[PDB]
Design a protein around this ligand. Sequence first.
Ligand SMILES: CCCCCCCCCCCCCCCCCC(=O)O
Ligand SMILES: CCCCCCCCCCCCCCCCCC(=O)O
Ligand SMILES: [Cl-]
Ligand SMILES: [Cl-]
Ligand SMILES: [Cl-]
Ligand SMILES: [Cl-]
Ligand SMILES: [K+]
Ligand SMILES: [K+]
Ligand SMILES: [K+]
Ligand SMILES: [K+]
Ligand SMILES: [K+]
Ligand SMILES: [K+]
Ligand SMILES: [K+]
Ligand SMILES: [K+]
Lengths: 48, 48, 244, 244, 271, 271, 194, 243
Amino acid sequence: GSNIHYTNINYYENAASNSLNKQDFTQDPEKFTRPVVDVMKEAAVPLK
Amino acid sequence: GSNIHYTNINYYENAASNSLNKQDFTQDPEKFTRPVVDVMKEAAVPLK
Amino acid sequence: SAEACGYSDRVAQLTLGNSTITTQEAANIVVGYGRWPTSLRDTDATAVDKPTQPGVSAERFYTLPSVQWTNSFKGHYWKLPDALSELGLFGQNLQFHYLYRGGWVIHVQCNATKFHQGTLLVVATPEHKIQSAESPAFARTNPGEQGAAYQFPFTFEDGTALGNALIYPHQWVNLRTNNSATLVLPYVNALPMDSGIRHNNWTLSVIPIVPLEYAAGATTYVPITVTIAPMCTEYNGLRAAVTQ
Amino acid sequence: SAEACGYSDRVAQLTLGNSTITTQEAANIVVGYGRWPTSLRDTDATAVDKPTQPGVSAERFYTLPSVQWTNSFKGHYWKLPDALSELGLFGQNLQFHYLYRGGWVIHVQCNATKFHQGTLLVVATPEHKIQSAESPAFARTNPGEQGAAYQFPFTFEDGTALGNALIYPHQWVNLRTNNSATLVLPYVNALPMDSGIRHNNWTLSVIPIVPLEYAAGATTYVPITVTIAPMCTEYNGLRAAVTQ
Amino acid sequence: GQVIKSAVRSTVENTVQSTHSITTEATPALQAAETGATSNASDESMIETRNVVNTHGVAETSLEAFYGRAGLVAMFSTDGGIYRWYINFGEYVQLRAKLELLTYARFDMEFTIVAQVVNAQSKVQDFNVDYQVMFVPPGASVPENQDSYQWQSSCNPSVISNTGLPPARVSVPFMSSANAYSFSYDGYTQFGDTSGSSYGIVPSNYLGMLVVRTCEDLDGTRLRVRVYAKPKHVKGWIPRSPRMTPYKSRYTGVYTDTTKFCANRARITTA
Amino acid sequence: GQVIKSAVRSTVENTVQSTHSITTEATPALQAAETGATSNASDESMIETRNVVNTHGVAETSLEAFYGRAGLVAMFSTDGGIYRWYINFGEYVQLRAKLELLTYARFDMEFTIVAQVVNAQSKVQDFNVDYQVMFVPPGASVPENQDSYQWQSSCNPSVISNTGLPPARVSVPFMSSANAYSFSYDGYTQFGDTSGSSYGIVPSNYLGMLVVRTCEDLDGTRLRVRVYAKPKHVKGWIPRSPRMTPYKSRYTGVYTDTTKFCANRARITTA
Amino acid sequence: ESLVEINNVESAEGVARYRIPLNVQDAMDGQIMALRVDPGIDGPMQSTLLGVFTRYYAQWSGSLDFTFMFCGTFMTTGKVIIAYTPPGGDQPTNRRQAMLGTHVVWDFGLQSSITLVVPWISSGHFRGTTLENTIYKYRYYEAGYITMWYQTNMVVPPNFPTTASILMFVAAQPNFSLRILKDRPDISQEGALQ
Amino acid sequence: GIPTLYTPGSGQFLTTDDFQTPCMLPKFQPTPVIDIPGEVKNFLEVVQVESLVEINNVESAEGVARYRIPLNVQDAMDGQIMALRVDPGIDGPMQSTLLGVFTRYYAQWSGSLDFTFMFCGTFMTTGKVIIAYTPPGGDQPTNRRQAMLGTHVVWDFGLQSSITLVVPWISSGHFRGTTLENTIYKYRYYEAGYITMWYQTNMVVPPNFPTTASILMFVAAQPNFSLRILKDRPDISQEGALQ
Ligand SMILES: CCCCCCCCCCCCCCCCCC(=O)O
Ligand SMILES: CCCCCCCCCCCCCCCCCC(=O)O
Ligand SMILES: [Cl-]
Ligand SMILES: [Cl-]
Ligand SMILES: [Cl-]
Ligand SMILES: [Cl-]
Ligand SMILES: [K+]
Ligand SMILES: [K+]
Ligand SMILES: [K+]
Ligand SMILES: [K+]
Ligand SMILES: [K+]
Ligand SMILES: [K+]
Ligand SMILES: [K+]
Ligand SMILES: [K+]
């Protein structure tokens, strides 16, 4: 996988010159998968 | 032989980019040479 | 006294499930790569369903049909788990599940007399390919419980030297010394588990390197018997029974 | 809210092994004699061999062939473990062992519409004998997975009153109220374990007491389906497979 | 106004061992797609699971990993020693389809230029020649000829290289007048005009043109040029439904109607 | 479950001085190969030895030292300006035989590409031309021609270089879906098929293909390409019996039977 | 979740291809549908969100969420069984064989939908996204089948529609991931666009 | 830019070079390393494993028979049983062994060698044999008396079926070339000596017993063994590319 240690010095003035971002994480997808006002717990029925 | 001191900095993001490993040791070969359950000491007869 | 004097006793007893095997002429016990069978670690596993672990119903000794050490005998081999795919509950669990993982305890038997001479190499080879033919026959890659006769022992059926098969877990049955070989084998694969009907992890070979000879008039009919026990097994991906 | 208000919710989910059953019109869940299935205690056991406990490979839901609620329908029954003796690994473990012990989770299904009326008694009877004939036919005492049709429902096939079958664990599928019945059954016998090929501990009966009727023109084809899961099972006395 | 949190993860979710469940209380399997919410039934609730410490990463699907590589955006040959390319990513479909997976996005870009000389029959030549690529922002005068005064490029940025040198390469910042580029625009380019040709294009996405020439005249040959673009430092918003029909035009998303996406099979009951 | 330890060493074993031994107790020389164990008789027990502080290293036989160098894996010439090479190491025997010394192995790889132009008579030309090597994973569309759209390579990784530049070179990680590559597989490629042609090959070892082209058309000449691979960061398991017969096929280990490995001599009693 | 183009047959055009046909039966245990679960192969899954992104990669891993919504009248009842058959053989031929695998029994009611989780059950940590055989022999990676059968029957009142539809949704679970980006095979062109 | 001066070697492709290079898939995350038995870190672990010597490499011996050293009841004393150069990397009986194959992947070697022999006659078959190692200087010993002046072991057939003769590392230099090729390099300089076997007494058997028996010969590297300078194994070759 990715190296825990490696050179990370910027040689140029503008950030546009920098190499690619190295975060690459993901986030809870709820804003897309469950964009609802009322919480609907997994163990209960959705509608009542 | 190998140098006791020398540059060891990774310039790339992925470990696959790194240069060759520099360990190169060997290990006790018993798992291949003597994979037996009962210990058979060098000074004794093997079977009794 | 054996552990005290630093030697291996010639007698042995192997007990698994409802089966017990004994021998009074063993030559120690080999444990492949110095590793006993082990369960799949949570950090190595990938299949998410809770596995089936049959226990004693499958982890016991199964004796296969004997093979005769004939004058022209070139050797015999059995694929694992193929050889036991239709035997007992081990076979049933193997058929009903997509995935299987397990180790083995192998006991090869061949007794003669102090008037006979001969030597068998008993070797358990990981990923042993039967590739002497342009297009390998299924009957030879998966011979089942009957096993298959060797046709190319010198080249180990795979284009390598028979004499170098010693790099794999093995023992010898040298008639003047012992009448049995015992090998404990851990699961080996590049995966946590695999299909028991599409891949054989180990191949047990019994090959005569020193032909069977004897004092004139001695018993000429000398069988070789293989008894194998699955050990530390687990299965995933349950469905209807499927065989290769 | 259900446990707070003191009522039973009409929805239910039953999950065992790799199987999940749901219903949105249940009528609580019955647990026979108020007892969930339990393992054999060391103080009750007699067979000395270490038992086989297959786990999820056998403790899961098996759905049997459906039965039609015909105009002349008198009822249908299935013997346990007989009905599952040839299904999955439960069947294999039952066949390969002399002794078996286990409980059950039964889910009977029958949906119609709010335009249909009818009522089925769903009862699990311990030691239910089919003794209406001088010499009972094996086809009726052990009907297998297909089950057998009732011929004498009023006398419960055993010389007792159908109306008193309520003394046994049961529920009703009254179409205006529910479309399924669920029963959890513990192992019951006068012995710690017994043969699964010679004795049926329970018999599941589905009997129409109020005939199926409906508004003219409604769907007339109404099936009844039974899904059963072995639970907390163990086996002793391993050998080759044997069926009755 | 955000009522739904978005915690970050660096690995996929583990699996925890689960046991049987026989109840009228918990019913994970029952769902209602009408709500607009994706099912929340977990593996552990539908079957009995084992423990799986899953260390699989999520890096290769990040926006940076998905978009962070070069793709062809322009390819042409000079005519009279010059070529004018309007900067837009609709000519070559691969990168185009990728960008349209997002509604809005901010990113810097790395442009790489690969050029070589070809003859009239389009046969490549081993000929080193100096070439100039000049970025002409909207409003600046575009040179008409290979030797026009605009090539002085005292203000317009230019990159001069040689077909004998490695590909030229320069980074560009997020240049839109907007706060993000738009890869879908349901509107018109100007007030007072509702012609179809001015629909679906956001003018702020067009930053100008690249004009290319050989510094001196080639004798009978031409300069072949390929321009590649690589998004960097990507920030994106509002995922979109992927393109499911072939592209037909460079500037519009017009398409040919279809009655199916995947090919047919004999019957729905045979996989 | 490991009952046999594997301590590491950085030098071979020393020799310690020993003296004579006349006893019925210790018998180091007596062995029993039937046990499956290699003799444990030491030099010091078989003869009278002197002290030898042996500083000989063990580095050059480590997996990294043995495998850590480039070897040819592909060599071909374009046809119509293109060539499709299925990534596999069975065509050239040297590296192939090395890899088969292990059953399973994990390693990254460094690929080096050396290319030059040759004419119809296979005579090398001093001609600098740009070439493109595109990695096409299984499932992705493989270009049919030198100018097909797939060369846009917006997602597929590509490396574009020139025969006038040093050899191209890129590293690749351990890419198998498995937890190690397998150099011996006693099984079939799929369920439901037991034909010999689907035996002995583990599909996960095949990661795709490399398709090569010259960016523009060569006039009557072709591109000659050699691909070298160098394993890096090697981890290996289960040593295997070395190949002892010539290879005959690229995808199978089929061989010609033989009655001897080494050549014969007049008699067993004359060395 | 996005819709699976499940009814991909000659007689179904456009929107109709998303509907799984259900009808009042006059026989028991009948089959309703079948599909390979592999998310990246050509077929009903290729045009889904999951399918498109899976087709942008060479390998995948993870459990899959297959959700179904019944769309008949409020008075229309029924029970169906949906099963996942791990690999090894061919798709199950009947309900008895299918129910031996991972499955869920769905009862039509107020809660209109049900989810069948196709758990990640694989020999390796990842699978190839294509099952292309002729060249790579990737049929090696087949993930199995999902089949649906009548558990009881679809039942309706007098004069009601005797046919109804089920919509099929699919999505990746939280343990799903993809590796090795590759060009989506569905996006192509002849000449440069003008 | 920082002023630089590029040097000779620039642009070259040394197959044994060791530089860092850009990765084709910079964000790729490999499958986890799982527990697999038999991990090997150095091939010295392999050459220390005994393998059979193709010792009876004569016209009359084919296949498996080539591993058997013939032994038979004698009617004369002090006779020879076998002979072999001990060099692990030269063409001959050793070339197909594990030790031989790896030695053939290198140019130089050092270390003691383990030669183990297993008797395979009947339990009633007895005998004593002497196995000797003759350090270099002359030709192989012509008779048992000459052979016994060197390093040796006297083996008595019995319950313990095998015996080990350690061929100790006795060399002028710390290493020896693995080939004895003379015409070009004159490497005959490195010859390590000979191993010979002789009847110490005789093979003796009861009435009607097989009067011939076999001995299997094993060889492996000792713990002080090492190899240097990797080279292509001469046994692996091809004409055209394989299809
Ligand atoms: C002097 C060197 C020349 C290098 C090229 C500079 C290019 C500057 C323009 C940058 C604009 C890029 C963003 C375009 C995004 C919109 C795409 C579209 O909708 O078609
Ligand atoms: C864009 C630059 C191209 C560089 C080459 C990339 C190659 C990617 C494939 C890597 C796979 C290597 C492992 C193969 C090992 C299996 C060998 C075999 O069994 O034949
Ligand atoms: Cl496909
Ligand atoms: Cl297919
Ligand atoms: Cl030689
Ligand atoms: Cl010589
Ligand atoms: K158990
Ligand atoms: K268990
Ligand atoms: K995790
Ligand atoms: K729910
Ligand atoms: K979900
Ligand atoms: K030392
Ligand atoms: K000893
Ligand atoms: K040794």
